[PDB]
């Protein structure tokens, strides 16, 4: 029974950092691949980035390249984004998000089904 | 980019509802499926998936919910609108890098 | 028919960059293989092993590679996975038999045999039987892409050799011995 649980949102100037975790239970964390996305008026749902299972890969939205990053500790379960210089428009909120179906734990398989989704958290 | 339409639908109690989703380009992925799926998000909590596959129920989706769809354009389904439906649907394919979403449609009770 | 040439040769190219010996005018002994305890898998598809000498083909393919023991089962039809997706697949079809034994003592290395590479990113599956042997850093959305930078990753990686050498022998001239 996947769950994720975000915290760690907060209101953030123009230029600085805030970084994100996610707490992920109901399934073996390591076995997955996990990822970012957030909702704003703007963009509605947007994907940000996903991290691999093992913790190797890291693949960004264009809007978010190379000012986020994404991150992985197995060793708590925890899902995190750092977000650095954080702009006016990255407000949004924050949800974690990954998949129920591993079976096929390769890029791009992972994006076709993001059916497990947090709470989500906001961040301005 | 996904579109969908009509932006707000508004649905009177008990009657059936239905959402498009138009996709700038083919959602069919390099091994033949359509990764289209749609989410439905209660104001204040997140969303949730229905439908997969374009018209695929998930485990514990009730049975008014379906769909149907090829290419580019696409629909989400209901049978009837329940008050415990309030809320946005969303269109979201993960056929092409990166996955987007639909700006989603707004469902009234 | 040169098999001893395929299963004792020594050394075996990588799954992705599969190496196809072709193997026709010629007398196909597979009692020599049928019966032996070289081979930890001996699994043929819709054809019977023990009357492999009585089935005569135009030609026979020995696709040869080493790939992980874990993998071994995705050279197989029907099949899905890192390997069977992007490094060597075998169609949905009959096909001839699969041959694999342990090669901790020959290929494996206390400290991880790297020289055997495999690919797990690529711009769709490959077809049956079909070679992708290119190395181009691999981008998510087919734009141009340099490594290390952010979405710019190498599609190959490398095995951490226990490996098991394989030998397909994929049928379409070559016959088994009579019986005098
Ligand atoms: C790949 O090489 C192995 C050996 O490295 C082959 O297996 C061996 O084949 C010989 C020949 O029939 C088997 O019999 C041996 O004959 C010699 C003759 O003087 C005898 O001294 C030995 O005691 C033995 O009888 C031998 O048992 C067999 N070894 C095993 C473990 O099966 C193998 O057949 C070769 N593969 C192919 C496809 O040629
Ligand atoms: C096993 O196959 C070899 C192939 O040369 C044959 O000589 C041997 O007699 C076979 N074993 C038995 C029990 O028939």
Same mark, same amino acid.
């Given at each position: 029974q996947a769950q994720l649980v975000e915290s760690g949102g907060a209101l953030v100037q123009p230029g600085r950092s805030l970084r994100l975790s996610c707490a992920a239970s109901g399934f073996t964390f390591r076995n997955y691949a996990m990822h970012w996305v957030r909702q704003a008026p703007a963009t509605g749902l947007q994907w940000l980035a996903v991290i691999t299972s093992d913790g190797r890969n890291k693949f960004y939205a264009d809007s978010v390249k190379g000012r986020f990053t994404i991150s992985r500790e197995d060793s708590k379960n925890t899902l995190y984004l750092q977000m650095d210089s954080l702009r006016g428009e990255d407000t949004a909120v924050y949800y974690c998000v990954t998949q129920r179906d591993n079976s096929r734990d390769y890029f791009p398989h992972y994006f076709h089904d993001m059916d497990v989704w947090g709470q989500g958290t906001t961040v301005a | 980019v996904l579109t969908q339409s009509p932006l707000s639908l508004p649905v009177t109690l008990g009657q059936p509802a239905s959402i498009s989703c138009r996709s700038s380009q083919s959602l069919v992925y390099s091994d033949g499926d359509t990764y289209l799926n749609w989410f439905q998000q209660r104001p204040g909590q997140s969303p949730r998936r229905l439908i997969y596959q374009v018209s695929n129920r998930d485990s514990g989706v009730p049975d008014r919910f379906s769909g149907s769809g090829s290419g580019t354009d696409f629909t989400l389904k209901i049978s009837r609108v329940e008050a415990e439906d309030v809320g946005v649907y969303y269109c979201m394919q993960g056929s092409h890098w990166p996955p987007t979403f639909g700006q989603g449609t707004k469902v009234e009770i | 028919?040169?098999?001893?040439?395929?299963?004792?040769?020594?050394?075996?190219?990588?799954?992705?960059?599969?190496?196809?010996?072709?193997?026709?005018?010629?007398?196909?002994?597979?009692?020599?293989?049928?019966?032996?305890?070289?081979?930890?898998?001996?699994?043929?598809?819709?054809?019977?092993?023990?009357? #492999?000498?009585?089935?005569?083909?135009?030609?026979?393919?020995?696709? +040869?590679?080493?790939?992980?023991?874990?993998?071994?089962?995705?050279?197989?039809?029907?099949?899905?996975?890192?390997?069977?997706?992007?490094?060597?697949?075998?169609?949905?079809?009959?096909?001839?038999?699969?041959?694999?034994?342990?090669?901790?003592?020959?290929?494996?290395? +206390?400290?991880?045999?790297?020289?055997?590479?495999?690919?797990?990113?690529?711009?769709? /599956?490959?077809?049956?039987?079909?070679?992708?042997?290119?190395?181009?850093?691999?981008?998510?959305?087919? /734009?141009?892409?340099?490594?290390?930078? #952010?979405?710019?990753?190498?599609?190959?990686?490398?095995?951490?050799?226990?490996?098991?050498?394989?030998?397909? #022998?994929?049928?379409?001239?070559?016959?088994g011995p009579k019986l005098s």
């Open positions: - | - | 028919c040169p098999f001893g040439e395929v299963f004792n040769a020594t050394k075996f190219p990588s799954v992705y960059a599969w190496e196809r010996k072709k193997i026709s005018n010629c007398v196909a002994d597979y009692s020599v293989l049928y019966n032996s305890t070289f081979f930890s898998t001996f699994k043929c598809y819709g054809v019977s092993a023990t009357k #492999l000498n009585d089935l005569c083909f135009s030609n026979v393919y020995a696709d +040869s590679f080493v790939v992980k023991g874990d993998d071994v089962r995705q050279i197989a039809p029907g099949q899905t996975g890192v390997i069977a997706d992007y490094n060597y697949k075998l169609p949905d079809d009959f096909m001839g038999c699969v041959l694999a034994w342990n090669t901790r003592n020959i290929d494996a290395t +206390s400290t991880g045999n790297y020289n055997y590479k495999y690919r797990y990113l690529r711009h769709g /599956k490959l077809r049956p039987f079909e070679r992708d042997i290119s190395n181009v850093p691999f981008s998510p959305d087919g /734009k141009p892409c340099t490594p290390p930078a #952010l979405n710019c990753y190498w599609p190959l990686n490398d095995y951490g050799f226990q490996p098991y050498r394989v030998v397909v #022998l994929s049928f379409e001239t070559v016959c």
